Point group: C5
């Protein structure tokens, strides 16, 4: 307890909070999805609801420490309000995301942060044909809402979505699920934005 | 990091917050809409639900800085709670607006602020005839709830709503969409209020 | 800006907040309704939903100032959390009221305050007969929940509800709408409570 | 204004907040219900929705004052966040309670507090037979969730629920409504807990 | 009052908050469920809704005190925001948990804490066959979301879920209900996580 209280005090009480990334000190966030369930499709509004968790990983110099000065602590859990977190947003959602897990992240001595929020998302998707053998494909882009590619870049560790926790008695079975980095240009804005495109192909079980 | 922390400290910790516009120092807010989806119509209550994002832009002297005094920083991202934002309100909503994007704005060295909230809005609209070839037209006014034209004026850069992110497999297709400045007089109040009228004509796809 | 920051500082930072009205210093609140839409009726639960805005007006000595000492400022906008507001409550609601406008009031140099919240209210009302020529009548009382007539009195400027913003394509048309001061006694309590009774007569369009 | 600001400052800024009742300084809370409407029944989930207000009354020494030292003020209104309030909970609810009135209480010079929250409650109730002449009976217990009878006791002033504000055009009419003190033992916990059992008998209006 | 205000001040104002368990100072949380109602099943989405309360118990050195230094106070009630509480999470929920009881815990002089939140949970469950004599079985794992078995361990006092407060007029009857410790490995993570698996077998009332 004593060593950890001291470490947290030194990282969070002694400085102002990290103000986020800049063009001079950009940040790369690693994203990965673990898909748990396609809960419902609404064919009258073209909305689909997913439950998943989203692994987020980044690294800051201001969160480094030497374990020997703090009783060999290599990592700790902390409330996500104590730290900056990236503003990763689904681009075609139709409702506010519902949070299904505690807002707690893990910080490691090299300055890396891992944050794995579980979410339920409603997004735009036409499920016509879901009851056929071929199924339907739907897609949703995840990226920073406010930072361009000059401040936040994204990457994945793999292009395969993790399906090993997928609910075996779901109404829908997954035929494939990929997660892929893309670059986008928008009408509002001259600079490239980065996203990860989650593409899921599914049908009725 | 260091230069930005210093800049934010100088703009926000050294003064009281901007108390909003006055008759002596009025403010012009530029509005523009990007329509993403007409999600649903309810013909039994005459309510329609849109998903869009609303570009808001204004300029304050108290947010100016010289880039050379702060490591050539020309702009930064900041929480919308750190700054004043205009109280832009839909005049015929039937539910509280749901916020679909992070509450983060971008401030530029000339004192200009850009804020682009994504929203889902339920508003008053009769969808009878939506299943015909001619479609239906619906309209909603956006403006300040509490400031008259003597404190807040509005403008648009174009009268065409941006449709380039419109969901291609929506239940509804858009025939036209305009955004137009207007002046209104109300029973309660002797002074002109300004709004932007969003007029959307649509039908079943 | 400078004059207004100074005025707000002198009214709000230099004293404790107004603790509300007393028997020695009672307060009169003026109420008026502007009815926008009867959104739905539920004949299986006897609930009706209205959208309206409610004009509230009162006057305090502690909010007076001389305009000449503050750059000729005659009024200003301020967050409703910065000031006391009356606890006006619908007496037959079935859900929490939903707030559809920003919580911002206007204070004038004579000490008068105006606050105009837009609301959606579900309340108790039997809509049987709404589809006939004669229509139905429904009523809801608005008053302080906790202050009797010895601390808060109410009045209206007119007994006619403002119908000039009523949605022209509503499912329901308004035949009449009145707002009238009344005195009530309740089982819990020996002292008179004051309310304004909103009586609306309507039918299917 | 001046006298009241001064009184509130003396009661709330000069001390730490009341930490709640103890075995040495127990508290009696008086409860009473005023039933406004049975809004709906759901026979597919066995849930019923009531709208009521709940009168709560208790007394603390730390809220006493002499009226003569404060301009003859005998009582005042204050936000319920400024004071401790009892944690009265429905024991068979199926949704969070919805609050329909402002969170404001009235404190009197003898140290007594009155707080009357209006609420909408969904609770467990089988409405099968509601459309008959005999109706259905449903019941819900209200009590402290965390304090036993050694710290919080409950009482009623009357066993009759107040029906004088009952909505006359409700879908349901009330045949009877009682509010009655009871003592319960729970498996988790060695002390008796006190509740008030609200029993309502109703049917479809005819 | 005076002794308790003093005790609370000494435990909460004089130090920083407990930063949670570590590999060097791990923590064991005891869990137990009391099932009140299966409120609904949705066979079109495979979601089931339960109402229960979850008894949580743990022990910290930093919450110890000697009763003789504080007027023989052996325990007290305190807001759950004043203390650390474990981040126990259902692993197959489809909605945020709804809280049905006040967020108040009880701390005892030996440093032990008891916290008993009542909750409504929607979780993944196929109710096909619920209308038969054999019924359906459904399961949900409860565990820390962020702490592995090296920081938080779990146990139960019994493997039988408490059914003595189960609503007698529910749409569903319970045939059996167990609560059992398990060890899991996940794709994200090399270290063991501990959970308690709540297994409930039920059918439509007949
Ligand atoms: N260079 C600048 O001054 C500046 C100003 C504002 C923004 C911005 C951009 C976005 C949109 C870009 C992408 C598509 C829709 C939103 N996400 C959202 N919010 C913002 F504040 N970006 C850059
Ligand atoms: N001249 C004054 O002292 C004053 C006082 C109050 C208001 C005001 C006006 C409005 C309504 C005007 C428009 C239509 C409905 C609302 N938005 C809302 N909230 C307000 F506080 N405006 C000016
Ligand atoms: N004389 C006193 O000490 C005192 C105490 C409490 C109240 C009070 C009254 C009400 C009810 C009056 C009206 C009908 C139902 C509620 N609204 C609600 N909340 C309250 F706190 N009024 C006066
Ligand atoms: N003597 C003690 O150490 C102790 C500890 C905890 C509790 C307690 C009891 C309850 C339950 C008792 C009743 C049935 C369910 C809940 N309401 C809830 N929350 C609590 F914190 N009571 C006593
Ligand atoms: N020491 C580390 O490198 C590390 C990093 C992150 C996490 C973590 C793990 C989890 C998942 C474990 C279990 C199954 C899915 C989630 N709950 C959630 N939130 C977290 F922050 N644990 C360990
Ligand atoms: C930390 O590491 C070193 C061994 O390299 C050891 O001397 C020390 O005692 C360890 N643990 C603590 C709690 O200090
Ligand atoms: C800032 O601008 C000057 C002038 O062009 C440049 O020479 C200097 O290297 C810049 N400093 C930075 C990017 O920190
Ligand atoms: C205030 O009023 C006087 C008299 O009309 C005028 O001369 C002065 O310019 C006004 N404005 C300010 C900011 O003092
Ligand atoms: C309190 O009431 C008495 C009436 O008996 C009166 O004389 C006195 O003025 C009042 N006190 C104050 C401080 O107003
Ligand atoms: C605590 O209990 C003792 C008996 O052991 C009693 O005599 C004393 O009055 C109590 N109060 C204290 C120690 O403050």
């Amino acid at each position: 307890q004593a060593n950890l209280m001291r470490l947290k005090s030194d990282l969070f009480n002694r400085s102002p909070m990290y103000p986020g990334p800049t063009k001079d000190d950009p940040l790369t966030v690693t994203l990965g999805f673990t898909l748990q369930d396609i809960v419902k499709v609404d064919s009258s509004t073209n909305e689909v609801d997913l439950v998943y968790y989203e692994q987020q990983r980044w690294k800051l110099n201001s969160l480094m420490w030497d374990p020997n000065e703090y009783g060999n602590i290599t990592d700790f859990r902390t409330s996500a309000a104590d730290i900056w977190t990236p503003d990763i947003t689904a681009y075609s959602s139709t409702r506010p995301v519902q949070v299904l897990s505690p807002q707690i992240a893990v910080v490691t001595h090299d300055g890396s942060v891992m944050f794995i929020p579980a979410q339920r998302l409603s997004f735009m998707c036409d499920p016509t044909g879901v009851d056929s053998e071929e199924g339907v494909t739907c897609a949703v882009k995840f990226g920073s809402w406010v930072y361009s590619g000059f401040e936040i870049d994204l990457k994945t560790d793999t292009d395969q979505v993790d399906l090993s926790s997928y609910y075996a008695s779901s109404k829908y079975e997954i035929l494939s699920a990929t997660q892929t980095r893309q670059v986008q240009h928008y009408s509002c804005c001259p600079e490239p934005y980065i996203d990860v495109n989650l593409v899921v192909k599914f049908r009725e079980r």
